[PDB]
Design a protein around this nucleic acid. Structure first.
Ligand SMILES: [Mg+2]
Ligand SMILES: [Mg+2]
Ligand SMILES: [Mg+2]
Ligand SMILES: [Mg+2]
Ligand SMILES: [Mg+2]
Ligand SMILES: [Mg+2]
Ligand SMILES: [Mg+2]
Ligand SMILES: [Mg+2]
Ligand SMILES: [Mg+2]
Ligand SMILES: [Mg+2]
Ligand SMILES: [Mg+2]
Ligand SMILES: [Mg+2]
Ligand SMILES: [Mg+2]
Ligand SMILES: [Mg+2]
Ligand SMILES: [Mg+2]
Ligand SMILES: [Mg+2]
Ligand SMILES: [Mg+2]
Ligand SMILES: [Mg+2]
Ligand SMILES: [Mg+2]
Ligand SMILES: [Mg+2]
Ligand SMILES: [Mg+2]
Ligand SMILES: [Mg+2]
Ligand SMILES: [Mg+2]
Ligand SMILES: [Zn+2]
Lengths: 122, 119, 54, 114, 207
RNA sequence: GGCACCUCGAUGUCGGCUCAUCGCAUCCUGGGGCUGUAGUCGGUCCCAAGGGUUGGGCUGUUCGCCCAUUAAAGCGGUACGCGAGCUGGGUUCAGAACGUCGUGAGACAGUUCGGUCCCUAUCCGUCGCGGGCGCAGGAAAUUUGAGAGGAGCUGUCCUUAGUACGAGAGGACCGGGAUGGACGCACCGCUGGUGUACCAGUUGUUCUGCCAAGGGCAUCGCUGGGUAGCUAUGUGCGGACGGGAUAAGUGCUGAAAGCAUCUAAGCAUGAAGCCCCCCUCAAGAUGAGAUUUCCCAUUCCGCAAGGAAGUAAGAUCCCUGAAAGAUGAUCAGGUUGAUAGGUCUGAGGUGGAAGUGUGGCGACACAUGGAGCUGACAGAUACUAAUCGAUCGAGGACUUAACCAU
């Protein structure tokens, strides 16, 4: 249940450490966005280097959430942190690596370039 | 479920723990209707605890029966009377140790009254 | 709120067509003969269902 | 509670060992990608075992690359090939929810063998 | 078309052959019995009557006894009428067993919702509340009644009152498995009504 | 803005909230004509009111600017809708200060800080739920449907096809298939919430004479779980395929007017609009309908009409309750009977009882033993209560007509 004003943490070495949510992309309602959705987001905290600055409106996808994600046969998966990856408005990531586990409802979308950069997929 | 009887979660337990030993020592009391319909399911469970005769059963029933004197001359008690007498008496009964009989209404507040007695 | 107009007699006693009593359910106690009310112990004779209650 | 019981008894799986909350085990899940049948091994502590009947489930928690991943299954699903049992732990609970916090803090909190 | 009458018993689960969980509602039945035929030369339509769940002879009166004693059977407790159907494969006294629904079909389920009592507006009509702080004295109340100019309230407002207990029809459900022996019908999803209640399972109207 | 007809023995004014409804001079979706329209996008005009029409930052704000989305972020009426529905930030009471004016008391269509919001619903209206009588004998069930309400929305992607069109750049109509957003209905098997007579640990202090074992109070003392019911954030489903007439448009034949012309005769086609199809209520539809089944050979008065009394089918009083419920009502039952309680046997919840023994100096640990305990879940068993009884409830009016027989 990612919604407006949430503070997620960035799951790669782009140059941002936390990010805030500005809008969920979808129809005219769209209060909530679960695993595998795109969000407009502003960089709150950043590292001194990196290719992303402080206070920037970037696109982002969502990889992990505390809220679970139900699967086909009635099995569930959950984490203990919300995490995101910075999209380049093209499905390629704006970084080089990924940090931690990545969900599995990504591969069922066009996010092959991201699931191919992860340590493992659960 | 069960009835709340206008009282609170502790006043209710106190009232029922009183009425239980009242009915035990007396073998018949008289109260309102609903307050006697909620008692023939708390008395029969204690008679079933008494028909066991164990020590665990005795310690389970002592945590529910207050300390009055049943037989003043023999210095008996509600717990000992329960076990000995009401285990010897209702020995081959399977449920249904009580019965309710309805009187008319009360006078002060027109409430319905009743009588409850060990069968 | 406050009554705009007073209430006539006709409405006042049309309203009270449902405000009355009901004769109870009484039967004959077949031990003494006086009238008790059904399913209750006879407070005149002291018995119910044949057997007695001292 | 009986008529339902039998029609669901038709589909009960009866080869897995018994286990309580708080003991490491290994699940062999038959994850599928569309053309092949891989097998992923996912081991961890059994945070919770809940429900009864054919609707009985259970939860397994592990810590993969820093963050902890919980994952629940229906006990009788056919996407599980087998269930090993690594060890047995000594716990006083039936629902281990204090483990969701005692991961970091530079202190390791694990169970004891019994 | 076709249809039968049964009793809701409660929800459960089953795994398909793919190995995936499916919510399932169980519905028992028995051999229903055709008690009467309504042809177009006697009435204005075409319809058969169905009986279900016979009851013991002490609970039946003489009208009902005589009515159900023309098909040579026992007094049935639930009587209904299935209207849109072909009326040549049905005779009085004949039975209608559960074995007419194959697996994977599509049906409708008619049943009486379960009662909720006297409910307010926030729960009955799914309205919104006022604030709970900032000095307000407004929450859980049905709102303005309308404009001043009509000098009256428009027919069609939404106020408290008794909720539930109506008749509801769910559409485009699907049969999972038909146990011919025990007279059972596993339907996917959930159906209206409290446990141990009458449920009408007809064929699909949309097609 | 003008006027001053109504209200001074009192109607209180702006924004926001809850709830809305109407108009069309249409923001989107639907159908078309012209184009300085090659295609994708546009312009302007015509038909169309069924549905839809956002989250924030600044300001008391209407207004307004900006950020990010969206198919679109319409314009207006309803006392600039709605204070016996809410608020009181802003409007004009009494305190205080700043600027300016006044000799002064003081004033400002200047600014700033603070500042009591009353009411038990009589009648109409709106939403639910019952008694009475009617419907030409008295009851029980199944129904038709005059008529009334509900729903009415859309995106992206793959194919057709990098084909038509186009130097190239770029790039389709029409038709097929998946999968989403907001909205509505139902439900608790999954994920969670609550669960104050369920299970466990623990602090202080009083009580059961004492130790062990427990009870009372301290927000349910606090803390960890949690059955049934009730629930959404959870799950399933829905707005499908069509038919009949139409609007603007496109027409085919065809004269008035030897030609031309959509029309005057005649024959078509054509929209998210209209009437059906889909869902719910419905014979107090006083126009009170239809179908199937039960009860009927009484007794008194009354020349007669009629009245009265016992009853039949059936119903109610009274009692045990919940899939029901403010109270009635409804539903399941009342001894040839499982309606409730109790007892057994289970499901689920908690999680290893008391006693004893062994090890330890002691706090404690291990065994007997998935132990003990268990509210609202399921099944068996008449052990307890649904005793005996009473009240209500028919005898079927006239007048014509058609066909058969004399
Ligand atoms: Mg809101
Ligand atoms: Mg008027
Ligand atoms: Mg004047
Ligand atoms: Mg004048
Ligand atoms: Mg006037
Ligand atoms: Mg006045
Ligand atoms: Mg127009
Ligand atoms: Mg801010
Ligand atoms: Mg106004
Ligand atoms: Mg005006
Ligand atoms: Mg008003
Ligand atoms: Mg002053
Ligand atoms: Mg000065
Ligand atoms: Mg001066
Ligand atoms: Mg102020
Ligand atoms: Mg009021
Ligand atoms: Mg449950
Ligand atoms: Mg002491
Ligand atoms: Mg002690
Ligand atoms: Mg005290
Ligand atoms: Mg207390
Ligand atoms: Mg607690
Ligand atoms: Mg029950
Ligand atoms: Zn008597």
């Amino acid at each position: 249940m990612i919604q407006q004003e949430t503070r997620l943490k960035v799951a790669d070495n782009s140059g941002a450490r936390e990010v805030l949510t500005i809008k969920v992309l979808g129809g005219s309602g769209r209060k909530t966005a679960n695993i595998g959705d795109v969000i407009v987001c502003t960089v709150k905290q950043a590292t001194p280097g990196g290719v992303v600055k402080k206070g920037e409106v970037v696109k982002a996808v969502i990889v992990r959430t505390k809220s679970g994600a139900r699967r086909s046969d009635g099995s569930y998966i959950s984490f203990d942190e919300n995490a995101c990856v910075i999209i380049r408005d093209d499905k390629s990531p704006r970084g080089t690596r990924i940090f931690g586990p990545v969900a599995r409802e990504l591969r069922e979308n066009n996010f092959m370039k991201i699931v191919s950069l992860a340590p493992e997929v659960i | 479920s069960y009835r709340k009887l206008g009282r609170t979660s502790a006043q209710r337990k106190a009232m029922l723990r009183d009425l239980t030993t009242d009915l035990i020592i007396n073998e018949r009391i008289e109260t309102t209707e609903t307050r006697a319909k909620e008692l023939r399911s708390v008395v029969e469970k204690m008679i079933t605890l008494g028909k066991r005769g164990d020590l665990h059963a005795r310690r389970q029933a002592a945590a529910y029966i207050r300390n009055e004197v049943a037989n003043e001359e023999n210095n008996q008690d509600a717990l000992q009377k329960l076990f000995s007498d009401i285990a010897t008496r209702y020995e081959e009964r399977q449920g249904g140790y009580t019965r309710i009989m309805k009187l008319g209404p009360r006078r002060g507040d027109g409430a319905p009254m009743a009588i409850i007695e060990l069968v | 709120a406050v009554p705009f107009r007073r209430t006539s007699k006709m409405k006042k006693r049309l309203r009270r067509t449902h405000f009355k009593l009901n004769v109870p359910g009484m039967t004959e106690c077949p031990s003494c003969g006086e009238m008790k009310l059904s399913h209750r112990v006879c407070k005149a004779c002291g018995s119910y269902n044949g057997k007695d209650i001292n | 509670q009986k008529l339902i019981e039998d029609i669901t008894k038709e589909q009960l799986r009866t080869d897995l060992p018994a286990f309580r909350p708080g003991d490491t085990l290994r699940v062999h899940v038959k994850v599928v990608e569309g053309n092949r049948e891989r097998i992923q091994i996912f081991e961890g502590v059994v945070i919770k075992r809940r429900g009864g009947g054919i609707s009985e489930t259970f939860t397994v928690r592990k810590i993969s690359y820093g963050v902890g991943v919980e994952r629940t299954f229906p006990v009788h699903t056919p996407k599980i090939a087998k269930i090993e049992v690594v060890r047995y732990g000594k716990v006083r609970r039936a629902k281990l929810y204090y483990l969701r916090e005692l991961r970091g803090k530079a202190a390791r909190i694990k169970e004891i063998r019994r | 078309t076709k249809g039968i009458l049964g009793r809701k018993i409660g929800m459960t689960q089953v795994f398909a052959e793919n190995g995936d969980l499916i919510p399932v509602t169980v519905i028992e039945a028995a051999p229903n019995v055709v008690l009467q035929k309504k042809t177009a030369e006697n009435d204005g339509y075409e319809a058969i009557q169905l009986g279900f769940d016979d009851k013991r002879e002490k609970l039946s009166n003489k009208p009902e006894k005589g009515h159900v004693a023309k098909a040579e059977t026992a007094p049935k407790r639930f009587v209904k009428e299935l209207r849109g159907v072909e009326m040549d494969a049905y005779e009085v006294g004949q039975e209608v067993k559960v074995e007419i629904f194959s697996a994977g079909e599509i049906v409708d389920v008619t049943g009486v919702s379960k009662g909720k009592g006297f409910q307010g507006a926030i729960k009955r009509h799914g309205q919104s509340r006022g604030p709970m702080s900032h000095g307000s004295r407004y929450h859980r109340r049905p709102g303005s009644m309308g404009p001043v100019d009509p000098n009256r309230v428009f027919k069609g407002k939404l106020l408290p009152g008794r909720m539930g207990g109506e008749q509801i029809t769910v559409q485009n459900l699907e049969i999972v498995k038909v146990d011919a022996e025990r007279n059972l019908l596993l339907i996917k999803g959930n159906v209206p009504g409290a446990k141990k209640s009458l449920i009408t399972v007809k064929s699909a109207v949309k097609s």
